[PDB]
Amino acid sequence: MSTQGLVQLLANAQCHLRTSTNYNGVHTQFNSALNYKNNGTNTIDGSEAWCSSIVDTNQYIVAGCEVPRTFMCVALQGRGDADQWVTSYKIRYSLDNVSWFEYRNGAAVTGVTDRNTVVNHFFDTPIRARSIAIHPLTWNGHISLRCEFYTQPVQSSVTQVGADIYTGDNCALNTGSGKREVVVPVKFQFEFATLPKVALNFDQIDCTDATNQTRIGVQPRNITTKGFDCVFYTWNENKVYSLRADYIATALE
Amino acid sequence: AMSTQGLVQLLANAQCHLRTSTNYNGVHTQFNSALNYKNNGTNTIDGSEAWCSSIVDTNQYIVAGCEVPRTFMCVALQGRGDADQWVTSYKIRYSLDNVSWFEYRNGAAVTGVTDRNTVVNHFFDTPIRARSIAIHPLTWNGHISLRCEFYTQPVQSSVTQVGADIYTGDNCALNTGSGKREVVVPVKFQFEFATLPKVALNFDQIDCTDATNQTRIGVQPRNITTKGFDCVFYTWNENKVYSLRADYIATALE
Amino acid sequence: MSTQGLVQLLANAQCHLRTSTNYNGVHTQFNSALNYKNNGTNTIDGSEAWCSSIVDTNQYIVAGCEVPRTFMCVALQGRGDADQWVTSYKIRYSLDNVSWFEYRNGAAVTGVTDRNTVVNHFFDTPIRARSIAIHPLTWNGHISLRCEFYTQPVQSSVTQVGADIYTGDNCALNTGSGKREVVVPVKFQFEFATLPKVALNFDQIDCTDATNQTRIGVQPRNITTKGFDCVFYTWNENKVYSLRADYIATALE
Numbered sequence: 134m135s136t137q138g139l140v141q142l143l144a145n146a147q148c149h150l151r152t153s154t155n156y157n158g159v160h161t162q163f164n165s166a167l168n169y170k171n172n173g174t175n176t177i178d179g180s181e182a183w184c185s186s187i188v189d190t191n192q193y194i195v196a197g198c199e200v201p202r203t204f205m206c207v208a209l210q211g212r213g214d215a216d217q218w219v220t221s222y223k224i225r226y227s228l229d230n231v232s233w234f235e236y237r238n239g240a241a242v243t244g245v246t247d248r249n250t251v252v253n254h255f256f257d258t259p260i261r262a263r264s265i266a267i268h269p270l271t272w273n274g275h276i277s278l279r280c281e282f283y284t285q286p287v288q289s290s291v292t293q294v295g296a297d298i299y300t301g302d303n304c305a306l307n308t309g310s311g312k313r314e315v316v317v318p319v320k321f322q323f324e325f326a327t328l329p330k331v332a333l334n335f336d337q338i339d340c341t342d343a344t345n346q347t348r349i350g351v352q353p354r355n356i357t358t359k360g361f362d363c364v365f366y367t368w369n370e371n372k373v374y375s376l377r378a379d380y381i382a383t384a385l386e
Numbered sequence: 387a388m389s390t391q392g393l394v395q396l397l398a399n400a401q402c403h404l405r406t407s408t409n410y411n412g413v414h415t416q417f418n419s420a421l422n423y424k425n426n427g428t429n430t431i432d433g434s435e436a437w438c439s440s441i442v443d444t445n446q447y448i449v450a451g452c453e454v455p456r457t458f459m460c461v462a463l464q465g466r467g468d469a470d471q472w473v474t475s476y477k478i479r480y481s482l483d484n485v486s487w488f489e490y491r492n493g494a495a496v497t498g499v500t501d502r503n504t505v506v507n508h509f510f511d512t513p514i515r516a517r518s519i520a521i522h523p524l525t526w527n528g529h530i531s532l533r534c535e536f537y538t539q540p541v542q543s544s545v546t547q548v549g550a551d552i553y554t555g556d557n558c559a560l561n562t563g564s565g566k567r568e569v570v571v572p573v574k575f576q577f578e579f580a581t582l583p584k585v586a587l588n589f590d591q592i593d594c595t596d597a598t599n600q601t602r603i604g605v606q607p608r609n610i611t612t613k614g615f616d617c618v619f620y621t622w623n624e625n626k627v628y629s630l631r632a633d634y635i636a637t638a639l640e
Numbered sequence: 641m642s643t644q645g646l647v648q649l650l651a652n653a654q655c656h657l658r659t660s661t662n663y664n665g666v667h668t669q670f671n672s673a674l675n676y677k678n679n680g681t682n683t684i685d686g687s688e689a690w691c692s693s694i695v696d697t698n699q700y701i702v703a704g705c706e707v708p709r710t711f712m713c714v715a716l717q718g719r720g721d722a723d724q725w726v727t728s729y730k731i732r733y734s735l736d737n738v739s740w741f742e743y744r745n746g747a748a749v750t751g752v753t754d755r756n757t758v759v760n761h762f763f764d765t766p767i768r769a770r771s772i773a774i775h776p777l778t779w780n781g782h783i784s785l786r787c788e789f790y791t792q793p794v795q796s797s798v799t800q801v802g803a804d805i806y807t808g809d810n811c812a813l814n815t816g817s818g819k820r821e822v823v824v825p826v827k828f829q830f831e832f833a834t835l836p837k838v839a840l841n842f843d844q845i846d847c848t849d850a851t852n853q854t855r856i857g858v859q860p861r862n863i864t865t866k867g868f869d870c871v872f873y874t875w876n877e878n879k880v881y882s883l884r885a886d887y888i889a890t891a892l893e
């Protein structure tokens with residue numbers, strides 16, 4: 134329940150994993166997910182953990198996401214099939230993948246004390262990053278671990294801007310009375326994957342007041358993934374020579 | 387090949403992370419999972435022409451994870467290149483938000499393959515919008531061994547910058563004179579776009595005098611580059627414009 | 641330094657890596673990062689390089705990113721622990737991951753001449769792409785390499801469009817004198833990860849002039865990750881019957 138609603142990054146295959154060294158080809162980051170278990174009857178499939186080949190304070194596993202995330206928690210766990218585990222570690226991270234930073238200026242975070250009991254560390258403040266790395270500092274037996282990172286869910290948007298949708302000069306809004314429209318079909322440069330929402334706002338106004346009142350409007354109608362109808366309008370006795378608008382359409386997920 | 391023309395081949399294009407339940411050993415891993423992967427047939431040490439599991443039961447899987455949502459059209463399954471092992475039926479599971487997972491067809495079996503090399507495409511009953519997708523073998527011949535591909539619609543990526551409150555100043559130069567008149571306010575984006583953006587630039591504050599009952603006001607970008615643009619406020623005819631304010635939305639694609 | 645300020649993709653775990661073949665499970669792309677070094681006293685952790693299984697002109701390593709990048713440079717390096725290196729190679733790439741292209745129309749790019757001296761190749765023109773591949777053409781000893789790709793920093797945005805925030809008909813701005821506001825609170829469909837910037841622009845105007853002057857405005861106040869206050873206003877003697885606006889809110893990184 135503590136990590137309820139959060140994204141399990143490794144379990145969802147949301148990150149690339151790079152390690153400093155691997156003991157051999159069956160002790161790699163392929164075997165790093167929290168609660169990873171393998172065939173206990175066969176030795177050939179290796180460790181229930183990522184295990185390094187060099188045992189020093191310079192090893193690490195780094196998880197990289199191309200989409201920034203808010204990291205709430207890192208969970209550590211020992212090796213499932215042997216008495217090896219990381220007792221403390223530091224966390225480093227980068228948001229822009231140019232400059233790196235250290236959590237708590239590099240101070241240790243409390244790890245685990247056995248093979249299987251997970252220890253969650255909720256960061257003192259949530260970390261905004263693309264890439265994050267566990268750097269083992271002290272260990273029992275060997276530098277061997279399983280892990281997970283828990284992030285807020287991400288949302289993804291795609292936006293298209295289109296400029297200068299125009300009624301034309303001396304348009305139909307410039308004669309008659311009551312509610313009047315000039316409809317201009319608009320087609321997006323590319324079709325959205327899901328239905329967009331559309332903002333559509335004025336950039337050029339050429340209109341005549343009526344008993345001192347300005348009455349002008351622009352609104353999308355019949356929004357699809359492919360485009361929409363830009364509806365310019367006026368009402369009452371107003372005469373409107375022209376209206377121009379820019380649009381911003383955004384689809385989510 | 388024709389049936390998936392124009393679709394993105396995820397594994398071929400290295401567009402997903404692959405995680406497996408188990409790997410037989412270090413030369414039977416997801417590194418060997420791509421459709422039509424072939425290796426050195428004269429040397430045994432490079433392993434299988436397939437991902438092969440370690441535990442042989444109904445709880446195995448390969449998960450493909452994408453950080454950017456995709457419309458999955460099809461999954462292609464193929465047997466192992468170098469030995470008589472293949473998956474004969476499987477289920478598909480997926481997640482869009484990476485919090486809740488769902489089973490395609492409520493977990494009903496999907497038809498797999500019947501030999502080493504003949505690909506069997508499954509186009510999903512309805513295309514699936516997802517970030518992560520998993521193949522869960524249900525029945526097999528010999529061992530749990532496969533090569534696979536996922537086909538998605540091409541994705542488009544945009545990057546957007548909003549800037550607020552580009553302003554003429556009070557009692558600006560548009561508030562005197564006749565004919566077409568402009569006040570130009572250079573705008574620099576917070577960061578340089580990778581490619582040329584398109585720019586929406588629209589009013590949020592208007593302070594103007596009509597001219598024989600006509601309002602005449604405009605704002606338009608000029609000289610748009612990846613670094614910024616010129617915000618041109620204007621009026622025309624005999625109109626006097628005290629001030630105009632605008633916000634901008636600039637978006638670059640791909 | 642020639643690559644200062646650029647993102648090191650492999651170092652930052654920003655790409656998936658697929659290879660044509662791997663010599664065995666300790667000669668894989670897990671060992672491919674520039675300057676990768678392993679345990680030199682133990683043979684079991686394999687090569688300081690990705691090494692192919694098949695030695696021909698058809699091998700490759702592909703780096704894939706879901707987020708388009710601007711590729712500035714590819715760095716090649718030999719194998720750290722043996723006299724094997726790639727002397728020339730070609731580059732191929734794809735932006736849409738459907739159509740692929742060859743750099744220099746397939747012509748050779750100069751590789752390396754020893755184990756450890758890095759040779760940077762800055763592309764004739766930067767390449768905009770999602771996926772990129774090194775294809776060895778000639779080699780010493782075996783097809784064995786370490787590498788890096790250097791890209792411009794990327795920025796990520798998330799955008800929400802909200803339509804039709806409205807004062808109501810015959811709103812409070814339609815009476816009185818002096819600066820007057822009507823405040824409409826707005827909650828975004830979802831909470832942004834970081835503080836957004838907000839564009840808020842007119843789509844319907846219904847107002848009276850005052851001694852021929854139009855005076856109208858709309859502005860966000862108290863923007864948070866969760867929403868903002870939409871402030872519609874007028875001033876002086878103007879009477880405004882109604883105003884309507886659409887918003888566009890974007891958060892970076």
Ligand SMILES: CC(=O)N[C@@H]1[C@@H](O)[C@@H](O)[C@@H](CO)O[C@H]1O
Pocket residue numbers: 346348368369846847881
């Ligand atoms: C139905 C109609 O035209 N209603 C208008 C209203 O929009 C507003 O302009 C008001 C100003 O006092 O005048 C009304 O006549």
Ligand SMILES: CC(=O)N[C@@H]1[C@@H](O)[C@@H](O)[C@@H](CO)O[C@H]1O
Pocket residue numbers: 339340374600602622623
């Ligand atoms: C060149 C010029 O000023 N053209 C204006 C036109 O924009 C519009 O306002 C029209 C209204 O009847 O009047 C014209 O004088």
Ligand SMILES: CC(=O)N[C@@H]1[C@@H](O)[C@@H](O)[C@@H](CO)O[C@H]1O
Pocket residue numbers: 593594628853855875876
């Ligand atoms: C404090 C105030 O109302 N200032 C207004 C100014 O905004 C502008 O409209 C100008 C038009 O000449 O008139 C001034 O009275």
Ligand SMILES: [Ca+2]
Pocket residue numbers: 296297336378379585586587605606607
């Ligand atoms: Ca415009």
Ligand SMILES: [Ca+2]
Pocket residue numbers: 550551590632633838839840858859860
């Ligand atoms: Ca504004």
Ligand SMILES: [Ca+2]
Pocket residue numbers: 331332333351352353803804843885886
């Ligand atoms: Ca609207």
Ligand code: NI
Pocket residue numbers: 148149150402403404655656657
């Ligand atoms: Ni990966």
